[PDB]
Ligand binder design. Structure first.
Ligand SMILES: Nc1ncnc2c1ncn2[C@@H]1O[C@H](COP(=O)(O)OP(N)(=O)O)[C@@H](O)[C@H]1O
Ligand SMILES: *[C@@H]1[C@@H](C(=O)OC(C)(C)C)C(=O)CC[C@@]1(Cc1ccccc1)C(=O)OC
Length: 338
């Protein structure tokens, strides 16, 4: 079997000429050559079966990405694993090869307004499809937005997704109702994340950083100002509402004071995405029709999912052995003789 940095990478003979790209907590990603289709691919080695949480995320990612088909969402081309469940210790997910992600890009590039608009449109175009399938991504952030060699943006990493029904490292893109531990979240939490990403494209700085939720919440309240009673009522948690009502008053910082050189249309849409009240937060289809994106907006070319999930997976209490069986069955379509 082929080897990369002393690690087994058992994807031959179809996939060869592996090159290390990076690694996460329980896997390694390489580029490779598909000798059968004569194309360059990415291959993610996943080894999740010793931890229930990794199995959860692996199953969700596979189930969702296999059911999605959209230009602005990463696809799965192939999945390699052992022919018997007892021998399956790793799963190799073959994907289109991307060149970078928005996180790395913002480390070195100050984007022009035109390119910010281009990226934002592609994010929202993909998000519209995701939400039409009744799915919340729940982990949108620059590092989960990949770009290929022709500058096409694809949303990736659906391991934290859920079907909509009202332990990550980077929490700077999470909506305030999550920090406040509100009862039921909606599609609006993804819109907030997109607002955070837009702000970071305009300045190359996170807009709401912080060491913890309390700190991050203060950053948010310092920019948006103190919420009104109408807004507070959307926080189901009574303790969170009492807390907020006890804080000193904060005035709203005008967006042009923070982003003095940004397109005023971009700031108007930013305002609608980063509203405290999730019920008043702009929706994906409304964001696409905002004047800031009028150069790109084309509903006839912005497709939706054929059949939404509306099928809460309910994996949170399944033992990792049950989850491994589900992952075995879900990957069986890539096995000869299925
Ligand atoms: N389809 C892909 N093409 C090219 N590079 C890819 C890719 N999917 C992931 N990568 C890269 O491989 C590295 C690890 O990816 P990942 O498995 O998702 O780890 P993580 N902790 O970022 O969530 C990242 O640098 C990521 O950009
Ligand atoms: C492409 C994008 C980019 O980094 O592309 C790769 C191939 C990943 C290096 C950007 O950084 C900005 C947008 C992009 C495509 C583009 C070109 C002209 C007009 C609009 C969009 C680019 O090449 O910017 C210079």
């Amino acid at each position: 079997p082929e080897m990369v940095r002393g690690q087994v990478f058992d994807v031959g003979p179809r996939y060869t000429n592996l090159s290390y790209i990076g690694e996460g907590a329980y896997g390694m990603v390489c580029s490779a050559y598909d000798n059968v289709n004569k194309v360059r691919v990415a291959i993610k080695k996943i080894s999740p079966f010793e931890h229930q949480t990794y199995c959860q995320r692996t199953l969700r990612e596979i189930k969702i990405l296999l059911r999605f088909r959209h230009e602005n969402i990463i696809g799965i081309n192939d999945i390699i694993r052992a022919p018997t469940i007892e021998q399956m210790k790793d799963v190799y997910i073959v994907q289109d090869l991307m060149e970078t992600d928005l996180y790395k890009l913002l480390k070195t590039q100050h984007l022009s307004n035109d390119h910010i608009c281009y990226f934002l449109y592609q994010i929202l175009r993909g998000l519209k499809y995701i939400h039409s399938a009744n799915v919340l991504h729940r982990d949108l952030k620059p590092s989960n937005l990949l770009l290929n060699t022709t500058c096409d943006l694809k949303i990736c990493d659906f391991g934290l997704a859920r079907v909509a029904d009202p332990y990550v490292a980077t929490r700077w893109y999470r909506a305030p109702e999550i920090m406040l531990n509100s009862k039921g979240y909606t599609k609006s939490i993804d819109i907030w994340s997109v607002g955070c990403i837009l702000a970071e494209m305009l300045s190359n700085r996170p807009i709401f950083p912080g060491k913890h939720y309390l700190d991050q919440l203060n950053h948010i309240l310092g920019i948006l100002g103190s919420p009104s009673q109408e807004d507070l009522n959307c926080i189901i948690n009574l303790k969170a509402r009492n807390y907020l009502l006890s804080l000193p008053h904060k005035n709203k910082v005008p967006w042009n004071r923070l982003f003095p050189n940004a397109d005023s249309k971009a700031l108007d849409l930013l305002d609608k995405m980063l509203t405290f009240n999730p019920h008043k937060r702009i929706e994906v289809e409304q964001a696409l029709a905002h004047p800031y994106l009028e150069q790109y907006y084309d509903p006839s070319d912005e497709p939706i999912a054929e059949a939404p999930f509306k099928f809460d997976m309910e994996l949170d209490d399944l033992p990792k052995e049950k989850l491994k069986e589900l992952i075995f069955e879900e990957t069986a379509r890539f096995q000869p003789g299925y």
